[PDB]
Design a protein around this nucleic acid. Structure first.
Ligand SMILES: [Mg+2]
Ligand SMILES: [Mg+2]
Ligand SMILES: [Mg+2]
Length: 66
RNA sequence: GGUCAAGAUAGUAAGGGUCCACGGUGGAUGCCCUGGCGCUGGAGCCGAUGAAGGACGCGAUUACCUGCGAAAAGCCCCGA
């Protein structure tokens, strides 16, 4: 999900979570410019997930520092 | 009526002229507003927490614009 699946997980996972999200994003690219990339959405969605992840580790790391 | 004689005037337009009909060119005029212009009133500073203003980037296809900043036409929270 968007709220309930990120803040339950710890950041040492986030680093390599980011990492794998990237990796798939990259292979996706290679596909795209190789053709055909029949599911363009998946790209932007992975973007969305990434932005989520970082927003999360950020707000969190700074709210645990209270 | 044919010949000859004397004398007179017609029509053709290569082209042009005036008018008429019919288009072409051009974009005046009328209408319209998606843009202005002034007056009244309101509001009036930004920035070392990086300003105004940019450069390069972010798109399934992206040259211009717009939005954005490698979390990149967007990301989290609340409210309509
Ligand atoms: Mg002639
Ligand atoms: Mg631009
Ligand atoms: Mg909302």
């Amino acid at each position: 999900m968007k709220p309930s699946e990120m803040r339950n997980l710890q950041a040492t996972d986030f680093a390599k979570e980011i990492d794998a999200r990237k990796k798939e994003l990259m292979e996706l690219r290679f596909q795209a410019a190789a053709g055909q990339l029949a599911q363009p959405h998946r790209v932007r969605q992975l973007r969305r997930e990434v932005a989520q992840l970082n927003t999360v580790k950020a707000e969190l790391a700074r709210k645990g520092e209270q």
